[PDB]
Design a protein around this ligand. Structure first.
Ligand SMILES: Nc1ncnc2c1ncn2[C@@H]1O[C@H](COP(=O)(O)OP(=O)(O)O)[C@@H](O)[C@H]1O
Ligand SMILES: [Cl-]
Ligand SMILES: [Mg+2]
Ligand SMILES: [Mg+2]
Lengths: 298, 10, 261, 10
């Protein structure tokens, strides 16, 4: 319906860009998520983030991507109506921090995230803000990519896009080091971080500044050099004075993971964007041979 | 951290 | 970053599917009571100059033209309002495509206060409503970009020339509205390649696109004429733009006399 | 980006 046909049930989300309510259609009873966007305080019209989010979501019809159901555009207000999902992965991880997420469920979620992401990339969309709070789970075992406010249509080949992309902890090294070009690999990096986070119940690289983030990565994966990453010493923010740390053994990093899991994770956190595994290839990894769709305990 | 914002241009 | 191989084919296939949906009506101008192809040409040529003033991407220009043709395909517009539609389209294309879109006040300024901020913003709303927010259109630009990958090693002069030819197609609705962006891109690429190196549309592209050099012919004949008559055309913003060394001054190159093809 | 230059009514 319209403004008047929705009953607001509660504020369920706040973010950099949107005011989000759980609401119900008074006429059909359907429960939805309402993302409110003020054009007010807006003397520039419809925000580019909303313009990209809406236009890209309309092209992204997939089981593992949140559904945009309606757009209500008025003089002062812009409302995005989404299907409602039970909760985000962040809330689920916190509720699971004591016990842990069962490995079969971690595998199912990653498999589904890769399917959503590979769908995006195949439709020339970069997400650019993959983090647990932007991933939505339902009660039946599904997980979906949400929050396309930072998303972008990309060209082949790629152009220089926005430097300020991705929440810090999930930000890829090519971005931190200041490459002008970046691509699909930045989404894979984020997913790798999220994988490791599900397994260990902790953020993999919780930096508190750009250089702290970069060193946390170096301390874990080893300081990159021209051999593992040709060109790295030429990046705009690279400094020859960076400490040279050695790579840690992954059994020390993600103890609970078997050889296949460690293999896949290492490939998702490859330094060189050109060799970092793609969503599509990741889906073919032996790690997923036995994948099922378990229900989470909510 | 929060989602980052575009640096001001000029 | 530099590598693009995994989703390359998927993206090309997807774009080929989008282009036959995000399509404007070939002869929609006959049904406009007050505006003509000549007015459209003047509008686009102006948008080229605007894009230069503000250092907007070529993609942004192609997108704006796409929006304009789709909007005019279903809305009657009086001549005195045509520039307002074009301004709103450029603003929207900028918001979609640019890192730094110019602000609305700036758009009002380059029309020389012909319209108010309120009008531009209200028009933005109307265009969004009429296009149903479907802004992620495929353009001649996107197809060229992919085609360029078949050039090894890369040839910057060929790329600038192809872009130049692609941009000239935007000015004249007759006859270019009747060709899909992928086909225009194909004829442009072949024509640029041929002019600069004497080589022809590659079999690898023919395979990928399904277009043989034969299927390019009709469009290629038109594009060749357009190229030959460019110095004569009433609209000159594109030639001026591509005289710059930024684009290897390709608009100063002489077209080939014949194609023998 | 922006490098405003001139203003024209069409
Ligand atoms: N469809 C939805 N169903 C349930 N919760 C949602 C939905 N969309 C968003 N949320 C919640 O609202 C929060 C903000 O949503 P998001 O669209 O990511 O906003 P922002 O752009 O402000 O981050 C999310 O972290 C999520 O927890
Ligand atoms: Cl999060
Ligand atoms: Mg979010
Ligand atoms: Mg967001």
């Amino acid at each position: 319906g319209h403004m008047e046909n929705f009953q607001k049930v509660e504020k369920i989300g706040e973010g950099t860009y949107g005011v989000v309510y759980k609401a119900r259609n008074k006429l059909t009873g359907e429960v939805v998520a309402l993302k409110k966007i003020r054009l007010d305080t807006e003397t520039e019209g419809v925000p580019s983030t909303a313009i990209r989010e809406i236009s890209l979501l309309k092209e992204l019809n997939h089981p593992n991507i949140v559904k945009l159901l309606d757009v209500i555009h008025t003089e002062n207000k812009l409302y995005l109506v989404f299907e409602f999902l039970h909760q985000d992965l962040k809330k689920f991880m916190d509720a699971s921090a004591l016990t842990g997420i069962p490995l079969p469920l971690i595998k199912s979620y990653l498999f589904q995230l890769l399917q959503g992401l590979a769908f995006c990339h195949s439709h020339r969309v970069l997400h650019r803000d993959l983090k647990p709070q932007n991933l939505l789970i339902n009660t039946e075992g599904a997980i979906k990519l949400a929050d396309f406010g930072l998303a972008r249509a990309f060209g082949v080949p790629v152009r220089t896009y926005t430097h300020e992309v991705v929440t810090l902890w999930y930000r890829a090294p090519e971005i931190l080091l200041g490459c002008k070009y970046y691509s699909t690999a930045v989404d894979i990096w984020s997913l790798g971080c999220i994988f490791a986070e599900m397994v260990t119940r902790r953020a993999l690289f919780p930096g508190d500044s750009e250089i702290d983030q970069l060193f946390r990565i170096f301390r874990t994966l080893g300081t990159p050099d021209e051999v593992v990453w040709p060109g790295v010493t030429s990046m705009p923010d690279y400094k020859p004075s960076f400490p040279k740390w050695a790579r840690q053994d992954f059994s020390k990093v993600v103890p609970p993971l078997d050889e296949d899991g460690r293999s896949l994770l290492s490939q998702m956190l490859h330094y060189d964007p050109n060799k970092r595994i793609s969503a599509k290839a990741a889906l073919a990894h032996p790690f997923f041979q036995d994948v099922t769709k378990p229900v989470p305990h909510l | 951290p929060k989602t980052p914002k575009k640096a001001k241009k000029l | 970053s530099n590598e693009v191989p995994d989703y390359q084919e998927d993206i090309h296939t997807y774009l080929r599917e989008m282009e036959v949906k995000c399509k404007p009506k070939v002869g929609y101008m006959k049904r406009q009571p007050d505006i003509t192809n000549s007015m459209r040409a003047i509008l686009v040529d102006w948008l080229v100059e605007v894009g230069e003033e503000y250092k907007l991407q070529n993609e942004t220009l192609h997108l704006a033209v796409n929006y304009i043709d789709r909007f005019l395909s279903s809305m009657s517009v009086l001549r005195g309002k045509l520039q307002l539609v074009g301004t709103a389209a450029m603003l929207l294309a900028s918001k979609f495509e640019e890192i730094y879109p110019p602000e609305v006040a700036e758009f009002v300024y380059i029309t020389d206060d012909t319209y108010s901020k309120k009008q531009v913003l209200r028009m933005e709303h109307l265009v969004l409503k009429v296009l149903a927010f479907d802004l992620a259109a495929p353009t001649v630009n996107q197809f060229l970009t992919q085609y360029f990958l078949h050039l090894q090693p890369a040839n910057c002069k060929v790329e600038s020339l192809a872009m130049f030819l692609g941009e000239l197609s935007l000015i004249d609705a007759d006859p270019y509205l009747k060709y899909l962006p992928s086909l225009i891109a194909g004829a442009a690429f072949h024509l640029a390649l041929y002019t600069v190196t004497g080589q022809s549309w590659p079999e690898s592209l023919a395979q990928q696109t399904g277009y043989t050099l034969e299927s390019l012919k009709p469009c290629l004949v038109d594009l060749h004429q357009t190229y030959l008559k460019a110095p004569q055309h009433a609209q000159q913003s594109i030639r001026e733009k591509y005289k710059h060394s930024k684009y290897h001054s390709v608009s100063l190159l002489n077209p080939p006399e014949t194609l023998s093809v």
